[PDB]
C-alpha cells in the first residue's frame, strides 16, 4: 500500500526531472532563507531591497529560460514555474520583481532584439547588475516615437510600472508611423535625457515591490535601441503571455502557504475542549484547499510541458492564470475567515497581494471572455 | 503556430497511448451506437435492460483490468477510466451497471478468491454471460453468516443493490463470528438458490436506466467452496469500493462534458434580441467555468490512473478525484440546466437526465472531505 | 416574548385580518383538495380541469379583479398570500392560477372593452371558463404571429409554444403583430374554443410542472371579429403589464415551495440517525437549516413590502424584478440544499425532487435569473446591457 | 411610480418623522466629522477620543437610554439608523459607539443601582466619560477572572483581552466569577491594581483604539458590584444589544461599498465604454442591491419588534449573521471590481473581515438558530 502525502497528493515531486527539482530546491532555500525574514517589515513600510535582483541573479533565477550564451541558466518552462511558485510562497511582491526581469524585459530583448542588443543587455539583466522595467500601460496607446537623425525621439507617459524608479533598463512600447502606424519596442537606459521615473507610494497590495511611472519628453533613443524584430500587438502580448504563466505558478505558491498556515492554526487552536481541526466544517475547507491546489498544479505543469514542446496555444494561459489566481484568492479568503485574532497573519498579507494579482495581467472576467470567444467564435468584448 | 482545441485544451488525446485511444474510441462507438438510442426510453420508463452485459463483454469492456488468463482484456487503469467516461457520457445508469461487474464483482473474486472460484466465475462475468452484483449496504453490518455442516447459512437484507434483480452471481459481505473474533467475510452465491430473493425497486428519481433492487437472505445455504478465503475485515469491500470510485471519478467527467457540449450548442443555436445566446458575457463566463473545471478534473483522473498503474497511488487520492469529479459534474449539470429554456422535449433536455443522475451519484455514499480532513490533520471528526 | 422558528418576524402579525382569513382559506383548500392529488398527478402528468371551478368558487381566480366582474376584489398582499399557499403544495397548481389571474383576467379587465369585460370575466372568475395566454412562440418584439385586416375583423396566422392551460382553455388571449396606419405594433386578440383555424395540442413528457397541462396554440388564418380585439393597448405595454402581474405572484409562490422543502428537510434530520446521533445535531446540517430560514424570512419581508407598495401605488416595475429574481433564485438554492441532504432515491421526501424540478422551470420562465439582473443593472446605471 | 435604485423599497417611507431626523443627524455628523479623518486615522492606527465628545454633544451615545439619565430616550429603530450611518464611514467608529451604548450604558442602566445610574449614565451620555466592557479573556462563559470577598468588599484578579476603548476608558465594566456565579463590577480609571495597556498593529478596526484589562488584586468598593444580575444573563444582555447595532451597521458599510463600486464602473472606461456596460458588472450590482435591500427590511422589522416587546433573542442571531456575511460578500465583490477614494473599499473590507469573525470561527449563530429549530443542541 502506497504512502499518502497530503502535502503532495499526486506526487508532483516525482513528475519532475532532477535538475528541475533542484532548481525548485534552490529557489525554496533562497526564498525561505533570504526573503521570509525581510517580508513583514518590507510590506509594513513598503520597502524594496533591490539587492534582491542581485541575489536571485547570483543563483540563476532571473530569466530562467534565457540561454547560457546570453548569461541565463538555460532552463525549461517547468523550471520557470517552480521558481515563481517558490518565490510567491513567501510574497507576491517578490514574485512580481522577478516576473518583470524575466518575462517583461529579458524576454522581449531575447525574442525581438538584434544580436548586439542581446549581447549588451541580457548578461547584466541575468545577474541583476541591471534592473529592468516594462512600459506599456498608460494613464489606443498614446506614447509616440518620431524619427530623428541618429534614431528616435519619444514622448508620453507610462503608469504603474513595477521596478521603474530603480530600473537601469526600460523596455518601452510606443507607436511609430512607410505610412502605416504601428507599435514598436525601444530599449532605454537610466540617464537618458528626457526620461523620468517618479516613484509611487501608498499601495494596498504588492507593497514589498516598488512601482512608478515612466515619463517621456522628447527622450532621444538611438537607432541601435529599437527592437528590430517586432511590430504591433505581438510584442507587448508575447511578454504578457510569458508573465501570466509565471503568475499562474506563483499564485499557487501563495495558496499553499495560506493553506498550510490555516491547517497548522486549526491543529494548534482550541474551542470547547477539542482542537479546531476536529471540526467537520473545517475539514471540508481544508479538503477544498487541498483539492484545488492539487488540480491547479497538474494544470500549470501540463501547460509547462506543452510550452516546452511547442504545442501550447495562448488560450491555455488564460485558463491557468484565471484558475490559479481565482482559486488562490478563494483559498486565502477561506484561510482568513478561519482565523479569530486581529503572526500567522501572513495570511492577511497574501490575501491583499492576491486581490491585486487577480486584477492585473487581465481580470478574472476578461480571461473568461477570452475563453468564451475561443469556444463560440463570438466576441463579447 | 500551435492551435487551440476548445474541446481538449490540454490535449489529453495526445497524453494517451494509441492503445488507450483505441480502447476509448471502441467504447465511444459502442455507447453512441448501442446505448444512446435507448436512453430516453429506458430512463423515462425505468426499463429493465440486460443485453448491455453481453454487448460490452463481446467487445471486451467488462473487467478491463482482469488478466486474459481469466477472460479479462488485461488492460490498465487509464483504460478503465476511459471506458467509464464513455459510457457515462451517455448515462450514469449504464456506467453504474458496468461498474458493479468490473469493480465490485470481478475484482473481489480476482483478488480474494480461490483458483477454483476464479475459473468458475470470471470468464462468464467477462463475456457478460453472467451478471454480477455486490451486497454491502443495508463494519457495523447486520447480515450474518453462521457456521453449519458443509458451509455457512446467511441472514439479512441488502438494500439498493444495482443489477440485483437480474444477477446470476451475488458477492455478499456478511459478519461471521468464529473462535471469539467477529470479522467480516465475503461470500459468492448463485441465481435461484434457496433462501435468496432479489426483488426490485421501482420509482427512482435518478439512475432510472438501471435496474436496482434488494438481496433477501432467508437462511441461505452457502458451501465452503464459496467463501472468499484471502480476506477478512475492512479490506474486502474497501478494495472494491476504491476500484469503483476510481471508475466513477472518470465517469462523472463524461456526463459533465455532455452537459457542457449540449449547453454550448444550445447557446449557439438559440437567438435572443437578434443575437445568439452565446454572445452574452454571462453565458460565456459559464462556458469558461465548465471548460476549466472539466479540463483540470481530467488531468486529475489521468494522473491517478497512471499512479495506480505504477502502484504509486494511496487510497486517499481516489477520494480527491471522486469527490471533485462528482461535485464539479453536478455544478456543471446545474449550470447547463439553468442555461436552458422550455421543458422536456428536446435533445438538450438530456441535461435534465444527467442532472438527476448526478444528484444520486453525488450523495450515494461528505465521506470524502472527511477522509481527506483526517489524512491532513490525523484527527477524525 | 418567545421564538417562532417557523415565522421569526411574525409576518402573521404584519397582516390585516381580512388578508389573514384569505390566507387560511387558501391553505385549507390547497391542503384539503390539492395535496391528496399532487403525487400521482405529477407522476402521471395529469391535470384535473375541475380544479379551476374549485378555485373559482372560493375567490382564487383573479383575486384583484373587482366584484362587478365576478372577482373577489382583494388587495395585492392577499393575491400573494394565495399564491404562496397554492405553491406550498405544487408550482404547477400555482401556475394554473397565476395564468387565469394575471395573464387572462388582468389583460381583459385592464385593456378590454366593457363588452369584453362583461362577456369574459365572470366565467373566468368562477372557473367555468379556463383561460390561456399566447405570447411565447417557437423577445416579444421578434414575434412572428401576424394579424391582418379582413372584412369584419382580422385573420390570425402563427404559432405559440409552452402555453399553460391551452389544451383545456375556453378563452385564449393571443398577442400578434398588426401593421396599421403607420406602425407595425403588438395587439391582443380574444379567441374562443371551437373557433375555426384554432388548435391547441397538448405537450407531453415535461420535466417540471407536470401537474399542470400545457400546450400549443396554432392559428391557421383564424378569424377574429372586430369585437374581439383589445382596443386599449399597443406594443410591449400589453404583454408586459401581464408579466409584471404574473411575476408578483410567482415571487410569493416560490417562497411557498421553499418553505415546503425547508420543512421537509428539517423533519428528515429530526428522524434520521448517523453514527448513533440524530442528523439534527450535526453542525453543518444546522448551518443549512439556518440559511434556509434566513433567506425565506427575508424573502417574505421583501414580497410583503412589494405587496404594500403596489396596493398604495408607490411601486415601480423594477421592484418586481428584484423579488421575482430573489424568490426564484433563493427557492431553487433551498430546493437543491434539501435534495442534497437526503439519501435514498425516489419517497415522501422526494416530494423535494418534485419541488426541485418545478423550481428549475420557474427560475427559467417569465424572465431568466440573468434577464432580471440586467433590468436591475440598467436601472442602476442608465446603460442597457441586453444586446 | 418612480424607481429609486438606491432605496427600492422606500425605507424612508417606513420610518417615523423623528426617526428620519435622527438618521440624518447621525449622517450629517459622520460625513461632516468622521469621513475627513478616517483615511489617516485608519492608516496610522490613531484614535481621537474627541469623537466621544462630539457624539455625546449631539446625543448619539446610549440612544435608548432615558432622558432621566441624560440619554436621548430614543427607540431601537433609531439606534439602528445611528449604527448604520457611523459604520457607513467606518466599522471602528461604530465599534467605539456600540461599546459606549450597548456594553457600558445598557448594563449600568439595566443592572445597576439608582446611585450607579445617577453617577455614570449622564457623563457617559455626553461622552465626558469613556467606557469599556471586560468579558473576553485571553484564551476563553466559564471564565477565570475572579472576585473574592474582602472587607468592603471585593478583590479582582485576572485578564481581559481585545477590549475596545480600554486605554482611554474612564469607566470599566468587568465580568468576574464570585461565590459561584458571574457578576459585573464597575471600576474607574485610577483604581490600584488595574491597568489598561494598548494593542497595536491590528489588521482591521484600526480606527478604534483597543487594549487589555489587567486586574492585579484590584479592589472594588461594595457599592460598585451590579446588584441586579447574576450569571449568563449579564454579559449576554449587553452582547445581544450590541449585535443588534452591528446588524444595522454592517449594512451601512455594505452600502458604501456598493455605492463606490457603482460610481467606479460609471466613471471608468475600457474598450471605448464604461465598465458599467458589462453584463458581468451589472449582475454584481444587482446582487449588491438585492441583499442590502432585503437585509434592511430584516433589521427594520426586528427593530419594530424590539420596540413592541415581541422579539425573542434568536431573531438578532438571524440578522447579525445575515448582515455581516452579506456585507462581507458585497465588500469582496466591490474589491474585485476595482482596477484613491475607491479604495475606501479595501478599508471597509479589512474591517468586515474582523467583524465577521469576532464571535469565533465556528458560526455560533447558525447553531443558536439550528438549536432553536430542532430543539437539539449541536
Numbering used by the authors:
A (entry chain D): 3 to 141, 149 to 186, 188 to 352, 356 to 394
B (entry chain C): 3 to 140, 148 to 374, 378 to 393
C (entry chain A): 4 to 141, 146 to 353, 355 to 395
D (entry chain B): 4 to 143, 148 to 186, 191 to 350, 355 to 393
Study authors write:
Although highly homologous in structure and sequence, the apo structure of GCDH from B. pseudomallei revealed a loss of secondary structure and increased regions of disorder when compared with the previously determined human GCDH ternary complex. In all four protomers of BpGCDH, electron density was too poor to model from Thr139 to Asp145. This loop extends from the pseudo-β-barrel region into part of the FAD-binding site, as seen in Thr136–Asp143 of hGCDH, acting as a wall to separate the diphosphate of FAD from the alkyl pantothenate moiety of glutaryl-CoA. This helical character is lost in two of the four protomers of the apo BpGCDH structure, further suggesting that FAD binding helps to maintain secondary structure at crucial protomer protein binding surfaces. Side-chain rotamers between the two enzymes also tend to be well conserved along this sequence, with the exception of Tyr373. In our apo BpGCDH structure this tyrosine is flipped nearly 180° from its position in the human complex, with a distance of approximately 9.2 Å between aromatic hydroxyls. In the absence of substrate and cofactor Tyr373 no longer hydrogen bonds to Arg97. Instead, the apo structure reveals Glu370 participating in a water-mediated contact to Arg97, with the catalytic glutamate carboxyl having moved 3.8 Å away from where it sits in the human enzyme.
Transfer of electrons from the glutaryl-CoA precursor to the electron-transfer flavoprotein is mediated by the cofactor flavin adenine dinucleotide (FAD) in both prokaryotic and eukaryotic electron-transport chains. Like other ACDHs, GCDH from B. pseudomallei (BpGCDH) exists as a homotetramer with tetrahedral symmetry and possesses an overall fold similar to that of the human enzyme.
